[PDB]
Every structure is written in C-alpha cells, then in structure tokens.
Design a protein around this ligand. Structure first.
Ligand code: 6BC
Ligand code: 6BC
Ligand code: K
Ligand code: K
Ligand code: K
Ligand code: K
Lengths: 209, 209
C-alpha cells in the first residue's frame, strides 16, 4: 500500500471527452482508487493542470505535476524527478489509454515488483515480420501497452547509461533494453487501446458499454 | 497484360455492405479493371456465388470459383487449382481488405514479378517485441497485408514441401518461409485495413471519403 508512484503522461487527443470526461481523467481515476498508489505525478502542459487539479481533495493520492519535454523519454524523465524519496515502484502510463483495467494494473504492478521491470502486452494479431535494408523478409511477437512498471533505481540507471554513453532511444522499452535486467511482459487485454483519432474514441464508447 | 490470376479469399464480415456494396466486391472490382489481371478465382461458400456472379459480363476478367477449406492455406490451395495453365503470377487477396489501392496492387505485382514473391506491408507503428517462454522481452518490423503475389510454380513447390515433409503452417507467409526464395515487402498504405468488426466498417466509410 502507498508503494507506487504513477507518472501519468499527458504532454490534443488525450483531452477530447469520452462520455463527457476528458480521456486523461479515466486512467487518472483508475490509479487514484488503488491503495497501492501513493501519488500521481501528472506530466502535462501547465495550460491543462486544472483538468486534474479540480479533484485533488476527492482522490486518495498525492497529486504532483511535471513539465513535459520534447520526446516521450524526456517527459518520463521529468515525472521521475518528482516521486516520494521512498517509492518502491514507478508506474508509467500513457494518458491516451483511458480504458486500462484495475485488474491489469494490479498484474503489471505485481510483475514489476517481482521482476524489477514489467509492461502490459497482448499477442500481436497481425502477421508481423522483420524486414532488412533490401526490403526482404528476414527468415511470438507481443504488442506493448502501458503501464510500464519499474523500480526507480533501475530506471535511473537506465537514464544514466543512455546519457553518459550517448545511446539511441528508439521505442518505448529502448532504455531498459541497454541494461541486463529482465523485462517481464504481463498479459493484458485488447480493450486497453490507445485513443488517438475519432474512430478510436468510438471504440472506447463501445468498450465502455 | 492478362498475366495475373487473382485468388480472392472470401470463405459473415466480408459481405456486410460498405456504402451499399458488400465488402468483398470492392477489391473484386479493383482487380477486374486492371489490364494485368486475366482472371479472378473467387474462393467462397457457394451460398454467396451470386454476389460475384451478377457482374461476369460487365467485368473484363474471366470469373472462376473454388470451394474453401478449413484453414486459410487450404482456401489458398483450392483457388490455386483453378488458374490459367500459363498465368505468370498469382495474386492472393483477403476480401476483408476492400480498400486496397490500384497503385499499391500495381507495386506488389511489379515486385512479385521481379523477385518471385512479394507482399504489401506497412511499418508497424506500435512497440512490438519478441517474448520468450518465460514471458521476458528478448533483447524494423512490418505489418503484412494483401495482396500476396507469387509465381505459381514457387507457391506449388511451397505446398509440395509443407505436404511431403509435414510442416507447420503458422502465419500468412509461413509456407514460403520454408523455401530459400526471397520474399519482398512492397510498401503499402495504412488505409488498406482489414474490415472485420463494425468499428472497422466505420473507418472504411471515412477512408472512402
Ligand atoms: N519514452 C520512453 C522510453 C524509452 N524507453 N523506455 C523505457 O525503457 C522505460 C522503462 C521501462 C521499460 C519496460 C518496462 C518498464 C519500464 C520507460 Cl518507462 N520509458 C521508456
Ligand atoms: N494461408 C496461408 C499462407 C501461409 N503461408 N502462405 C504463403 O507463404 C503464401 C505465399 C506467399 C507468401 C508471401 C508473399 C507472397 C506469397 C500464401 Cl499466398 N499464403 C500462405
Ligand atoms: K541492473
Ligand atoms: K489507433
Ligand atoms: K526456389
Ligand atoms: K481490426
């Protein structure tokens, strides 16, 4: 209980309402009601702080804020600077995923605690293949979602390594890929979609019923 | 000209209308108007033959039919048995992809002719990772679409090898993966979606405007 700090990424499609509520507030509330969660560090343009700020006394978590940066990793880093000095786990979530299930958050938190780093994923349904520089097929794949859950010292070491040795950040689990620590893939739900265009918004409404 | 035989897979979501026309007819017509295409072998439950049969004298291709089988590869094989004895290329298409562009069909036909086997693909947008049996991340991916275009002798040899040596067919390019022949990935369009649920159907309508 109160061992997890959520970094909620909300640096605009994550504020378009879903049944009257901005998309970013759904996951915000899902996390707030979990007794595991001590605090939520919201990463957002200060223009939208109000959207979250209205609910501070009514939620049972500490609310903090962080300034976004140029790339997703910069926004992750900024949020990381604000967590309780004794948080055992950081839980990084894309606010564009409003429909994440509490049960799946529970699973990835559990796996993150056990393993050190964990991320929600689902089996990739489509035929997906590695392709080389000459456009030829190179002769189980999982699609990643969020939360991404990691022990703060682990993530700090990852940022430290990328920084000092000047490494290339390419995708959403690139930083830990440079470390030798294992990353567990917690099996999630296909309903935990990223809601970035009006067609997704419609999906979200059907899932919400 | 008249060098390509299309195997149109329509073995029910591919007959739900899109702006009044069953989904399966969109690609059917796209292929019919191409002077490269000699014939279309439609693979469908005979219950729906009429849907295609109505247009035979008005299209400029020979129309043939084949019975589906249990798995997609069986349906591919059945269609293969019906093509002109002198077709230089077979063009396999999932009728659930109604929005394929003529220009992209032209590209994959060109690449299939040059290389021997080619398939439309797009860069996979999501973070996708290989995961091992212990649920851990294994430390460019492309999403495949159709058409899949192949020289008929190449595809026949592939079915022959899988059959005689009893190999496991897993995904949509599995059969050729056993051969040493290269498979080219022709860059397609994100609009060439597979339309399997009412939300896709809505996507299709927006793309169609
Ligand atoms: N942006 C961004 C980004 C790039 N890499 N990377 C990363 O490795 C983690 C850490 C992490 C990875 C997997 C599972 C949990 C945590 C997080 Cl949270 N973000 C990023
Ligand atoms: N079902 C099914 C199926 C499984 N494998 N496989 C395959 O290799 C090809 C041939 C092909 C592959 C890549 C590019 C063109 C053709 C086709 Cl057409 N279908 C299948
Ligand atoms: K380590
Ligand atoms: K999407
Ligand atoms: K060969
Ligand atoms: K779909």
């Amino acid at each position: 209980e109160k061992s997890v700090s959520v970094i909620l990424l909300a640096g605009p499609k994550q504020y378009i309402p879903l049944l009257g509520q901005p998309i970013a507030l759904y996951s915000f509330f899902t996390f707030s009601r979990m007794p595991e969660v001590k605090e939520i560090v919201v990463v957002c343009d200060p223009f939208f702080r109000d959207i979250f700020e209205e609910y501070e006394e009514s939620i049972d978590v500490d609310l903090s804020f962080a300034i976004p940066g140029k790339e997703r990793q910069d926004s992750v880093y900024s949020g990381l600077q604000e967590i309780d000095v004794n948080s055992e786990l950081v839980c990084i979530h894309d606010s564009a995923r409003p429909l994440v299930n509490t049960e799946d958050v529970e699973k990835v938190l559990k796996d993150g605690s056990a393993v050190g780093a964990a991320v929600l994923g689902v089996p990739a349904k489509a035929t997906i293949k590695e392709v080389n520089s000459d456009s030829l097929v190179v002769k189980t794949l999982w699609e990643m979602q969020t939360p991404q859950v990691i022990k703060p010292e682990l993530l700090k070491k990852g940022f430290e390594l990328v920084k000092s040795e000047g490494l290339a950040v390419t995708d959403d689990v690139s930083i830990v890929e440079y470390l030798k620590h294992p990353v567990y893939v917690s099996q999630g739900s296909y309903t935990n979609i990223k809601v970035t265009t009006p067609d997704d918004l419609l999906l979200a409404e059907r899932i919400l019923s």
